[PDB]
Amino acid sequence: QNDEVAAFCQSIMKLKTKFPYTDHCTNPGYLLSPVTVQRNASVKVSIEIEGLQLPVTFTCDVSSTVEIIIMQALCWVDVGSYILKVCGQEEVLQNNHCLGSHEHIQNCRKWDTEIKLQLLTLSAMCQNLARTAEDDEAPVDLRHPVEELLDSYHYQVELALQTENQHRAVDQVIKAVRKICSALDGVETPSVTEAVKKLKRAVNLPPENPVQVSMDHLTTAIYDLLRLHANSSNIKEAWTATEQLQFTVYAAHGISSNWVSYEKYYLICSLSHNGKDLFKPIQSKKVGTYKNFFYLIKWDELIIFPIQISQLPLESVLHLTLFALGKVSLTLFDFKRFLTCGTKLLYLWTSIVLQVDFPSPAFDIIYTSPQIDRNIITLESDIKGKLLDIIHRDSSFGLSKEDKVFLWENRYYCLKHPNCLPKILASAPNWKWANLAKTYSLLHQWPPLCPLAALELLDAKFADQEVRSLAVSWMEAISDDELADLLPQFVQALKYEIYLNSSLVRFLLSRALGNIQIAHSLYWLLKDALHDTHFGSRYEHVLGALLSVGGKGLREELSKQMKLVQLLGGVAEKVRQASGSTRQVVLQKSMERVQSFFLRNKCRLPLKPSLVAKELNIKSCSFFSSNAMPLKVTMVNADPLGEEINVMFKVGEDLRQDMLALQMIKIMDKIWLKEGLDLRMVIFRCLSTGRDRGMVELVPASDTLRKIQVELAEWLRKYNPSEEEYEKASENFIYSCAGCCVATYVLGICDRHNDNIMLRSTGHMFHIDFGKFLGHAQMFGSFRAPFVLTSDMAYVINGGEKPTIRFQLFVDLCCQAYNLIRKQTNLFLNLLSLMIPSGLPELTSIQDLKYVRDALQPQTTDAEATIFFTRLIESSLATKFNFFIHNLAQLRFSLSFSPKTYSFRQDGRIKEVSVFTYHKKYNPDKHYIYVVRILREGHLEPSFVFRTFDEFQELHNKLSIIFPLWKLPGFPNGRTHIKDVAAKRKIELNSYLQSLMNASTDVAECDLVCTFFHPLLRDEK
Ligand SMILES: Nc1ccc(-c2ccc3ncc4ccc(=O)n(-c5cccc(C(F)(F)F)c5)c4c3c2)cn1
């Protein structure tokens, strides 16, 4: 453990060299203003400049870079020294990026607020975060209780040398050993047990004495126990070793008195590679409790696994579950690729330490990768024309096993499409050592693929160190700005690294050192990720490495933010206590502790670190009247240019779900305006600051549909009086609502009522609550409304209670958005998949991802999808239309009347078959069902099945594909009556069956025939 941690710490010290504090690029000391490249105007900008009372105000064209805008400003009053920052926000604009790229400018242009920038030199910029010379210079880090017990042991041995009273002295020796074991988590190695029993016997049995030699064996056995407990400090290759994988589970040490009270204990042993087990788990023998010094659970059972060491892949790990008291996991190869050998002491937690003895040969077995093939590589049509359809496939989910085997065979012909490599690697048949030569030699010549698509290669299914490393190598093509918004997926992807010092963690630390915003985001994500029981330890280690590398300035700022979070936590929790008028008083009394630490502590806002705070505005700060009792905190800005900071802070409810929902919506808007569709969406942030509590970005001049109801078109009219301004404010409503519609369906957020739908003064619509964000199955399976579009919301669409051209436009926008998200189904699925391990409710199963995919209809053509979504909108506006759309949506995502196939070897052969009688049925249609009498071989009692003439027709047509028409009997083809035709068809079908079961043995024993006569729900009663 600590040897792996030392290696990790060394590699961190190496990583710090490429980021010296002297380089301003890697260590600016300030946040950069996040930018999103938008496809396809001028606006007014006020730029503060040094020496002038009033800022310079002028119209600045958006296309122009920031550099030329600085040069434009310099005219009214060193080139590299001047930079532009946002007024009241400690975030600097990008130098070589256009103005309308930055989130702050685009937010300002959608909101319609004055752009306030400040031109200043790098010297004048606050850099309290900048990593100093001491930080860069310092080492990376993340008292001894047994020394005295060893001293006492050696002293008791020195006294034992006196032959006056040997027995006496030896007793105090043995007692010393007891205390040592008790201190070492209670671990008594069998070497010590045998050494103490040998000592007792060598003392009782009177150039060496028997007491001296047996005591020298004690010392040896204790120091060997220490070597194992600390786990600190002739080479055969792994693919040579033909030995079976085996180890000897010894005992669990330092057991509590409460355990002896559970009758018997046993372990379940599993071996896994890319997440899924390799073989059925192996149980251990059930044993009670053994006693020598302490109470233990002695097993001493060899466990052998049906594979050789050669077969073992590098990333293979051994799981031992205790009986579900605790689960331990051990990597069969260490971080240095040496195969686990000798005794191993594993740590388990309950409401403790497991000794596992691995074979310790004289020679150390190490694992090594195969050499590179270096082949470095003929086109054939039709098969190509078809293969292109399989590379066109959305993802690896929409692939049949036959498609996978066909794709893997035409492997080297897909070198012209890098983004399908996850489809190839998920279509790889085997993961054997000999086949790795081919795959690795392919990957090393494989052209780098889109970093968004490289997320897929970071899931558990692609847990090969070389694949992961290449994935991380290709990931270094994204902007930090694009990364930050994907960062949580990467934090959860750290779970699928068995070794601490992964490529992934190195990349994340590299990016965190290059950008404070990334480090800031990583901090809160790793903080909430510590709540994991298993990966807790790992996440502490990567967070500790981030803090130690981030410098004293950054870490001290984050420590400030942490205490601010904890104080506001305690305040918000005190409001849940009181439901009287007293509640409003408890805010001010609880504020004593909060405003006190603000004295000589300019803390940054955890939700938006660019904002700095001095103190609170008691008059402004109020509660929120719901069930969670959230608090809006109005903090005065430290920069007098900046406006007051309104932020919500919630306790009791889990925000992890909200965060994921909002990240999805943000990425939807991103990919929308990445193609040139700007549905002017409302993007509000949210930060899980701990355990079911965190900060929420507040939206000014916005209320829910309940508060507007108690007072819709009149609300917007109040804020936009002019009918000119009103129609322009309604245009915003159409675009925002459309974006909300496509987001609500595709995500499967169904629980849409007046309280979770919200509108702002400008007319932009946004959803706030995401309790059941991924509840797709509830919407599909049962009759939960996919989207709610109120008649009032239809009134807000230009034209009141009238068919309008603007509604057809709205539909066109909805359809265009739907298609644009359908093109990126894989990205959405990969993001959700990586966020499964978080333990978020409604995202636990792969089926949840499949449901999203089925709701996205990626196979369907854009035009057919637009028809589907238009008829969804038509529904949203009677119950009859809603139920019809429900039936067509269910039928779309989905022998006919018997899905499951059955053979005569399961149900039992048939002796006699006749059509007993015919029954008339009106439901669903006015048809005739026929009661077929079946007598099985050896069965006394006759069964019955009920089959309609259409269910017979299907069978005759199904059998005509395999068997010829001359071998099968003729099927019956107006006159008489409907009852007389049914009465004659009875006898004609009875003649057809008799002729079918006596034609030949191949026909009468076909699997379709058995299936046709198989019991179903229509047959049973
Ligand atoms: N899960 C959630 C719930 C609510 C919000 C949310 C976000 C921004 C707001 N911006 C402005 C306003 C203005 C008046 C206002 O009342 N709210 C608001 C709406 C619903 C619930 C609450 C709550 F009780 F939970 F605090 C507050 C809000 C806002 C509520 C975010 N996430």
Backbone angles phi, psi at 374, to 5 degrees: 60, 35
Q: Is 879 exposed, middle or buried (0-12, 13-18, 19+ CB in 10 A)?
A: exposed
CA–centroid distance, 62 to ligand 1, in Å, is 33
With CA atoms as reference, report the closest residue to 528 among 694, 648, 326. Answer: 694
Residue appearing with tokens 């400040």: 118
Atom of ligand 1 at shortest range from CA of 626: 24
Work out the end-to-end distance of the chain between its first and last CA atoms, rounded to an integer number of angstroms.
Answer: 65
CA of 520 to the centre of ligand 1 (A): 25
Burial letters 804-824, b for 16+ CB under 10 A, else e: eeebebbbebbbbbbbbbbeb
Indicate which atom in ligand 1 lies nearest the CA of residue 700: 11
**Residue with CA nearest ligand 1 atom 11:** 699
Is residue 928 within 8 Å of 920, Cβ to Cβ?
yes
Q: Whose CA is nearest to atom 8 of ligand 1?
A: 698
Q: Which of 608, 624, 705, 761 to mutate to test the pocket of ligand 1 (most atoms within 8 A of CB)?
A: 624
The answer to whether 855 and 776 have CB atoms below 8 angstroms apart is yes
| Ligand 1 pocket: which of 576, 583, 648, 663 to mutate (most atoms within 8 A of CB) | 648
Burial, 259: exposed, middle or buried (Cβ in 10 Å; 0-12, 13-18, 19+)? Answer: middle
Q: DSSP string spanning 128-145? A: SSS--HHHHHSPP----S
Give the mutation target among 768, 769, 772, 773 for probing the ligand 1 site: most ligand atoms within 8 A of CB: 768
Backbone dihedral angles phi then psi of residue 124, each to the nearest 5 degrees: -75, -15
Give the distance (Å) from ligand 1 centre to CA of residue 760: 12
Contact present, 483 and 32 (Cβ < 8 Å): no
Residue carrying structure tokens 């968004």: 452
Strands 91-92 and 31-32: parallel
Q: What is the homologous superfamily of the domain 235-366 according to CATH? A: C2 domain (2.60.40.150)
CA–centroid distance, 661 to ligand 1, in Å, is 16
For ligand 1, atom 27, which residue shows the shortest CA distance? 624
Cα(106)–Cα(95) distance, integer angstroms: 17
Contact 158, 152 (CB under 8 A): no
Contact 849, 858 (CB under 8 A): no
- Cα separation, 190 vs 178, whole angstroms: 13
Q: Relative to the CA of 630, which ligand 1 atom is closest?
A: 26
Q: Which of 323, 191, 317, 302 is nearest to 252 (CA)?
A: 323
Distance 626 CA to ligand 1 centre (A): 9
How far away, in angstroms, is 754 Cα from ligand 1 center?
12
Which CATH number fits the domain 31-137, given the four candidates 3.40.50.280, 3.40.50.620, 3.20.20.70, 3.10.20.90? Answer: 3.10.20.90
Task: Please give the helix or strand (H or E) that residue 255 lies within, else none.
Answer: none
Burial (CB count <10 Å: 0-12, 13-18, 19+), residue 280: exposed
Q: Alpha-carbon distance 745 to 177, whole Å?
A: 68
Ligand 1 atom 15, closest CA: 703
Q: b vs e for 773-800, b when ≥16 Cβ sit within 10 Å of the residue's Cβ? A: bbbbeebbeeeeebbebeeebbebbbee
Nearest CA to ligand 1 atom 16: 703
Ligand 1 atom at minimal distance to the Cα of residue 696 = 31
> Of the candidates 701, 828, 670, which has an alpha carbon nearest to the alpha carbon of residue 103?
670
CA torsion, ordered 99, 604, 617, 756, to nearest 10 deg: 70
Planar angle of CA 57, 59, 61, nearest 5 degrees: 140
* Best CA proximity match to 498, nearest among 534, 527, 532: 534
Tokens 């003439």 sit on residue: 949
Q: By C-alpha distance, which of 446, 271, 437, 280 is closest to 368?
A: 437
> E strand or H helix at 573, and its extent?
helix 536-577
What is the per-residue burial (b if ≥16 Cβ within 10 Å, else e) of 211-234? beebbebbeebbebbeebbeeeee
Taking CA atoms only, the protein residue closest to ligand 1 atom 22 is 624
- Could you give the CA distance from residue 404 to residue 409 in angstroms, rounded to a whole number? 9
Q: How far is the CA of 755 from the centre of ligand 1 (A)?
A: 9
Give the distance (Å) from ligand 1 centre to CA of residue 771.
14
Q: Helix 433-443 to helix 465-475 angle, to the nearest 10 degrees?
A: 10
- Using the mean position of ligand 1's atoms as its centre, give its distance from the Cα of residue 714 in Å: 22
Between CA 812 and CA 791 the distance in angstroms is 20
Q: What is the DSSP string of 368-437?
A: -PPPP--------TTHHHHHHHHHHSSSSTT--HHHHHHHHHT-GGGTT-GGGHHHHHTS-----HHHHH
DSSP state of 244: E
**Paired sense of beta strands 42-48 and 56-61, if any:** antiparallel
Residue 451 Cα to ligand 1 midpoint, Å, equals 35
Give nearest CA residue, ligand 1 atom 5: 768
The token duo for 65 is: 């870079």
State the Cα torsion 513-516-521-527 to the nearest 10°.
Answer: 70
Atom nearest to 704 CA in ligand 1 = 19
Output the CA 766–ligand 1 centroid distance in Å. 11
Helix axes 147-160, 166-183, angle to 10 degrees: 170
Considering only CA atoms, which residue is closest to atom 19 of ligand 1?
Answer: 704
3-state secondary structure of 239: helix
- Ligand 1 centroid to Cα of residue 702, in Å, is 9
CA of 44 to the centre of ligand 1 (A): 32
Displacement of CA 727 from its chain's centroid (Å): 42
What's the gap in Å between 651 CA and the centre of ligand 1?
13
DSSP 75: T
Give the type of residue at 959: L
Taking CB atoms and a 6 Å cutoff, what residues make up the pocket around ligand 1?
Answer: 624, 626, 628, 630, 648, 658, 684, 696, 698-699, 702-704, 768-769
DSSP class of residue 46?
E
C-alpha distance from residue 400 to each of 345, 390, 406, 847, 929 (Å):
45, 10, 10, 16, 37
Task: Report DSSP letters for 582-623, one per residue.
Answer: THHHHHHHHTHHHHHHTTT--PBPSSSTT-BEEEE-TTT-EE
Closest C-alpha residue for ligand 1 atom 29:
698
3-state secondary structure of 636: strand
Cα 1012 to Cα 383, 652, 665, 937, 947: the distances in Å are: 37, 56, 49, 17, 9
Residue type, 340: T
Alpha-carbon span 622 to 631, nearest angstrom: 6
- Which CATH number does the domain 383-554 belong to among 2.60.40.2550, 3.40.50.12280, 1.25.40.70, 1.10.10.10? 1.25.40.70
Dihedral of alpha carbons 13, 17, 23, 28, sign? negative
What number does the ligand 1 atom closest to the CA of 627 have?
24
For the chain, the residue count is 1021
Phi and psi, residue 279, nearest 5°: -145, 155
How much distance in Å is there from the Cα of 768 to the middle of ligand 1? 7
Q: What six digits make up the tokens of 695?
A: 């900060």
